[PDB]
Amino acid sequence: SSEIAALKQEIAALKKEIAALKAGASVQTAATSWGTVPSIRVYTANNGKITERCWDGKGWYTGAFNEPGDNVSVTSWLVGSAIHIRVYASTGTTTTEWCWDGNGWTKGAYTAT
Amino acid sequence: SSEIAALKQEIAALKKEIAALKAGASVQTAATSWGTVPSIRVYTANNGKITERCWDGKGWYTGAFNEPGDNVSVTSWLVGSAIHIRVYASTGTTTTEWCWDGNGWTKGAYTAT
Amino acid sequence: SSEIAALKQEIAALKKEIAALKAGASVQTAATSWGTVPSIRVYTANNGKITERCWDGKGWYTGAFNEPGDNVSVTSWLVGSAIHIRVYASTGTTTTEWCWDGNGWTKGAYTAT
Numbered sequence: 001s002s003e004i005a006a007l008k009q010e011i012a013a014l015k016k017e018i019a020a021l022k023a024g025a026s027v028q029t030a031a032t033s034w035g036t037v038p039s040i041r042v043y044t045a046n047n048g049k050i051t052e053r054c055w056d057g058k059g060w061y062t063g064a065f066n067e068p069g070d071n072v073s074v075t076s077w078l079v080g081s082a083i084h085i086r087v088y089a090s091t092g093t094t095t096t097e098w099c100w101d102g103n104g105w106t107k108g109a110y111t112a113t
Numbered sequence: 114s115s116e117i118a119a120l121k122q123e124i125a126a127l128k129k130e131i132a133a134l135k136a137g138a139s140v141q142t143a144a145t146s147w148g149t150v151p152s153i154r155v156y157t158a159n160n161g162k163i164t165e166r167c168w169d170g171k172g173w174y175t176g177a178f179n180e181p182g183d184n185v186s187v188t189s190w191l192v193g194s195a196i197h198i199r200v201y202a203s204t205g206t207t208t209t210e211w212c213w214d215g216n217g218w219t220k221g222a223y224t225a226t
Numbered sequence: 227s228s229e230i231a232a233l234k235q236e237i238a239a240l241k242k243e244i245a246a247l248k249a250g251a252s253v254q255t256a257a258t259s260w261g262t263v264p265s266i267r268v269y270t271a272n273n274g275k276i277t278e279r280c281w282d283g284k285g286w287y288t289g290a291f292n293e294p295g296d297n298v299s300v301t302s303w304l305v306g307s308a309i310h311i312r313v314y315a316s317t318g319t320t321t322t323e324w325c326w327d328g329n330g331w332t333k334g335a336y337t338a339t
C-alpha cells in the first residue's frame with residue numbers, strides 16, 4: 001500500500017540521524033601538567049562517570065579522583081612544589097567543582113550563578 | 114494487524130535512541146587560572162551561549178565575557194601581573210577567538226585556515 | 227487515513243529532536259600557550275579529524291599535527307625555551323596521546339587503564 005510506504009520512508013530518513021549522533025559521541029578528556037618532570041593528570045569523562053590517570057615521570061597509574069560527569073574541564077597551579085587542582089564536572093546544567101589541595105578531593109564553592 | 118505491527122516495532126526501536134542522546138547532551142566548560150592566589154575563570158557554553166564565572170580569592174562572581182558558542186576552549190598567560198586570555202568559541206565549524214588584554218574583550222585574528 | 231495516522235504522529239514527535247541534536251553538534255577545540263610572546267596552538271577536532279593552528283607573534287599558520295579524533299585535550303610545558311606538548315585525541319573510548327618534544331610528533335605511552 002501507499003499509506004504503509006509513507007511511514008516506511010519516514011523510518012528510513014529518521015534512522016539516518018541515529019548513526020551521525022552515535023558517530024560523534026566519543027569520551028571527553030581534560031589534561032593539566034606542572035613542574036619540570038613533568039607531572040600530568042588526564043581526566044576522562046566516560047558514560048556520566050569521570051576518572052583520573054596520572055604520570056609522575058615513570059609510568060601511568062590511576063589517581064584517586066572518582067566523580068560523576070558527562071563533560072570535564074581542569075586547571076592546576078603550584079604554591080611552591082605543592083599542586084592545587086580544580087576539576088569542573090558537568091551533568092545536565094550542573095557544573096560541580098572538585099578541589100585537590102594536597103590530601104583529599106573536596107566539593108568546591110563554585111556556583112554557575 | 115501485522116502491517117500495523119511492523120511500524121509499531123520500528124517506532125519502538127527508534128524512539129528509544131532519541132531520549133538517551135538528549136539525556137546525555139550536557140553543558141561544556143573551559144577553565145584557566147594564574148598567579149598564586151589564584152585567579153580562576155570558568156567559561157560555560159550552555160545552549161549556544163557562553164558565560165564567564167570569576168574567582169579572585171574571595172568568592173565567585175559573573176565576568177564580562179558574553180558571546181555565542183556551543184563549544185569553548187581557553188588559554189591565558191601573564192605579562193608581569195597583567196593577565197592575557199584567549200577564549201575559542203565554536204558554532205557549526207566556525208571557531209571564533211575572543212581576546213582579553215586588560216580592558217575589553219575583542220574578536221581575535223584567529224582563522225581556522 | 228486513521229490507521230496510518232498513528233505513525234504520522236510518532237514521526238511528528240521524533241522529527242522533534244533531530245533538529246536540536248544537529249543544532250548543538252559543533253566542532254571541538256583545545257588551546258595551549260607558552261612564553262611571553264606568546265606562542266599559542268589551537269587543536270580543532272572536526273569530523274573525526276583533528277588539525278593544529280599556530281600563532282608565534284606574526285600571524286596564524288597550520289601546524290604539523292594531523293591525527294584522527296572526535297574530542298581533543300592539550301597541555302604543554304617548557305624545559306627552558308623548548309616547548310613540550312601532549313595532545314589527547316579521543317575516538318569512541320580510545321584516548322590516544324600524541325607527544326611533541328622539539329622535532330616530531332610520536333604516539334605516547336598513555337593507556338586509559
Ligand SMILES: OC[C@H]1O[C@@H](O)[C@@H](O)[C@@H](O)[C@@H]1O
Nearest residue numbers: 041052054063064065083100
Ligand atoms: O599521586 C596521585 C595523586 O596526585 C595528586 O596530585 C592528585 O592528582 C590525586 O588525584 C592523585 O591521586
Ligand SMILES: OC[C@H]1O[C@@H](O)[C@@H](O)[C@@H](O)[C@@H]1O
Nearest residue numbers: 086097099108109110151168
Ligand atoms: O578551598 C576550596 C576553594 O578553593 C578555591 O581556590 C576555589 O576553587 C573555590 O571554588 C573552592 O571552594
Ligand SMILES: OC[C@H]1O[C@@H](O)[C@@H](O)[C@@H](O)[C@@H]1O
Nearest residue numbers: 154165167176177178196213
Ligand atoms: O575581574 C573580572 C574580569 O577579569 C578579567 O581578567 C576577565 O576575565 C574579564 O572577563 C572579567 O570580567
Ligand SMILES: OC[C@H]1O[C@@H](O)[C@@H](O)[C@@H](O)[C@@H]1O
Nearest residue numbers: 199210212221222223264281
Ligand atoms: O591582540 C589580538 C591578537 O592577540 C594574539 O595573541 C593572538 O591571539 C591573535 O589571534 C589576536 O588577534
Ligand SMILES: OC[C@H]1O[C@@H](O)[C@@H](O)[C@@H](O)[C@@H]1O
Nearest residue numbers: 267278280289290291309326
Ligand atoms: O612551528 C610550528 C610547530 O610548532 C611546534 O611547537 C608544534 O606545535 C608543531 O605542531 C608545529 O608544527
Ligand SMILES: OC[C@H]1O[C@@H](O)[C@@H](O)[C@@H](O)[C@@H]1O
Nearest residue numbers: 038055312323325334335336
Ligand atoms: O616521551 C614520551 C612520553 O612523555 C611523557 O611525558 C608522557 O606523556 C608519556 O605518556 C610519553 O610516552
